[PDB]
Ligand binder design. Structure first.
Ligand code: ATP
Ligand code: MG
Lengths: 49, 502, 70
């Protein structure tokens, strides 16, 4: 809805260009830090089995 | 700018002979006019400055006139003109989603309403032939209303109580809750709504349009508004104008709903307006026909037969009473016009029952019992299990112990009392109601604690909408709770109760 | 009154000869349009013209559970 009302707005320069610049990049996704306790906690209960 | 110039070329400067009466007095709103020979009663007369008024009394010397506006631009010796029409307001579906004043001019600023047909504010209720009985339900989404005190479509139901107990909120959860039918597909489950604000300050009516626009409720209502700043003949005319936009729907097929908030402020605008016309006072200085004032209003709320269109017009009048006394003059005159009531109290609100409905006293001529088929199963037994509770559960001082005898029954009530409580501006559905009521009456909650049932409800309700969506769609479609549908629900409550608190 | 119809259009065209906003503002329109321009930003917020969203989020750290078993 950024492109919708900026087209009907006439004051361009910082309007249609800001939606052109800030909407041309990638989504900052999260980090995958949960892998150590996935394997090391699991097999110690299966080895105790 | 092109907009101002195009408004001035469309203006028509038509001139004709008027019919004209010189003013003899002006004080406190009443303008005794010399002249005005051929005037009708209840005709709309138009002052020189742009004001408007309605000639009530006819008399041989003078003509009594009350003003829709302000009486300071009017000086003795002015000119009163003749329109030639008994007082009428615009009507249509084109007013939908607006806030309007008591004569149909917009106070929201989205522009001129484009309306085509005009309808009087003094028309007549339909008689005995063109009605039919009440077949349909009107769902409020409150759980103490839909199960215990149901309301049909076409039935005048009175919400009565004190100040600050829930009378406006009850009638605004009802506005919100019809959102789910209005974006659906069939044209006979919708319910178009109307709110009439009489004697209310503008910092409540401009705040209620906010609550009705985040939930997108305002796309199917109208708000007729006569604030406390208005002239006393504008708070008198407001419910007769709001009810006449309701009868665009009802006299063309659809189903309407109308809330008068409230009708104890359409009476003190009649007591003042008709004391300055020198009419002799009755009881509490009210006029002779305050009963005729409310009765000619509350009988247009019809339910037409199916050879006229079959449309309905519910009505929900609000009444504020002083100190919770219901034997006053204006309460008892309007208890005996409505089919049923909803008695809101204060000691229910403060002990914790909110919405504070006295389910003992909230009687209702059930409206040919159009509750619905599945709710009849679970709230038929609920009605009796709660009635069994109230006869026996008022001691607060115990001396003897009969857990096999009495303490089993009163444990079924507190599980069904604390089930009946609700929040605010979040109204349920009917099959989400059948599920949560199933788990209360079938003994599946007597091993909880009553301080955890309000917590049990939202965890239950989120589990069934997420994981069991095809279950609830067979209750809403088939109407009834079938025996195989009784089978599937028997595990879900017990599977969830096996892992609720862990 | 078509003689009045011409006389409010012809003094509307005179308003269409404009240089800098108001014709007779003086200290009136300059103060009012600046008092109102603050109030659309005062209780609303401090916002520039084109600055994008600049932030960073951190998720919940996944702790482990110690468990001697069997
Ligand atoms: N379902 C509810 N549960 C708990 N509290 C509620 C509920 N509905 C309303 N309230 C609260 O009760 C108070 C009064 O409600 P409301 O304003 O509707 O009463 P009212 O009698 O219409 O007021 P007034 O007398 O000014 O007309 C409000 O503060 C509201 O927040
Ligand atoms: Mg109220």
């Amino acid at each position: 809805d950024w492109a919708y009302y900026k087209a009907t707005v006439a004051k361009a320069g910082l309007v249609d260009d800001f939606e052109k610049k800030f909407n041309a990049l990638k989504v900052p996704v999260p980090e995958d830090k949960y892998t150590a306790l996935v394997d090391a906690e699991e097999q110690e209960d299966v080895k105790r089995c | 700018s092109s907009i101002l110039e195009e408004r001035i070329l469309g203006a028509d400067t038509s001139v004709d002979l008027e019919e004209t009466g010189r003013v003899l007095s002006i004080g406190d709103g009443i303008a005794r006019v010399h002249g005005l020979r051929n005037v009708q009663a209840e005709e709309m007369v138009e002052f020189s400055s742009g004001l408007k008024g309605m000639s009530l009394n006819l008399e041989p010397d003078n003509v009594g006139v009350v003003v829709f506006g302000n009486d300071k631009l009017i000086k003795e010796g002015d000119i009163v003109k003749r329109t030639g029409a008994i007082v009428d307001v615009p009507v249509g579906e084109e007013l939908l989603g607006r806030v309007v004043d008591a004569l149909g001019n917009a106070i929201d600023g989205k522009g001129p309403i484009g309306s085509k047909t005009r309808r009087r504010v003094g028309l007549k209720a339909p008689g005995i032939i063109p009605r039919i009985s009440v077949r349909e339900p009107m769902q409020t989404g409150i759980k103490a209303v839909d199960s215990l005190v149901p309301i049909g479509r076409g039935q005048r139901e009175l919400i009565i109580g004190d100040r600050q107990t829930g009378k406006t909120s009850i009638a605004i959860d009802t506005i919100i809750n019809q959102k789910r039918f209005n974006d659906g597909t069939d044209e006979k489950k919708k319910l178009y709504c109307i709110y009439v604000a009489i004697g209310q300050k503008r910092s409540t009516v401009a705040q209620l349009v906010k609550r009705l626009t985040d939930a997108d409720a305002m796309k199917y209502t109208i708000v007729v508004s006569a604030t406390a700043s208005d002239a006393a003949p504008l708070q008198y005319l407001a419910p007769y104008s709001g009810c006449s936009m309701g009868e665009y729907f009802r006299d063309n097929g659809k189903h309407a709903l109308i809330i008068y908030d409230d009708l104890s402020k359409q009476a003190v605008a009649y007591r003042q307006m008709s004391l300055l016309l020198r009419r002799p006072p009755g009881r509490e200085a009210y006029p002779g026909d305050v009963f005729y004032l409310h009765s000619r209003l509350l009988e247009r709320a019809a339910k037409m037969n199916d050879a006229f269109g079959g449309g309905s017009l519910t009505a929900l009048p609000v009444i504020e009473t002083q100190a919770g006394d219901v034997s006053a003059y204006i309460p008892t005159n309007v208890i005996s016009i409505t089919d049923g009531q909803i008695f809101l109290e204060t000691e229910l609100f403060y002990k914790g029952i909110r919405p504070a409905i006295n389910v003992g006293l909230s009687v209702s001529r059930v409206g040919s019992a159009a509750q619905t088929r599945a709710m009849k199963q679970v709230a038929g037994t609920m009605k009796l299990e709660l009635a069994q509770y109230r006869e026996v559960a008022a001691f607060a001082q115990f001396g003897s112990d009969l857990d096999a005898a009495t303490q089993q029954l009163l444990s079924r009530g507190v599980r069904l009392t604390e089930l009946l409580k609700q929040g605010q501006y979040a109204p349920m559905a009917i099959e989400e109601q059948v599920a949560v009521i199933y788990a209360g009456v079938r003994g599946y909650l007597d091993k909880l604690e009553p301080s955890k049932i309000t917590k049990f409800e939202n965890a239950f309700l989120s589990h069934v909408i997420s994981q069991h969506q095809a279950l609830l769609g067979k209750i809403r479609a088939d109407g009834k709770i079938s025996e195989e549908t009784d089978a599937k629900l028997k595990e879900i409550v017990t599977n969830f109760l096996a892992g609720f608190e862990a | 009154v078509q003689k009045l119809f011409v006389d409010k259009i012809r003094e509307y065209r005179t308003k269409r000869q404009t240089s800098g906003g108001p014709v007779d503002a003086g200290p009136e329109y300059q103060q009012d349009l600046d008092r109102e321009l603050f109030k659309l930003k005062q209780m609303y917020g401090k916002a520039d013209m084109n600055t994008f969203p600049n932030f960073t989020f951190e998720d919940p750290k996944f702790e482990a559970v110690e468990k001697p078993q069997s």
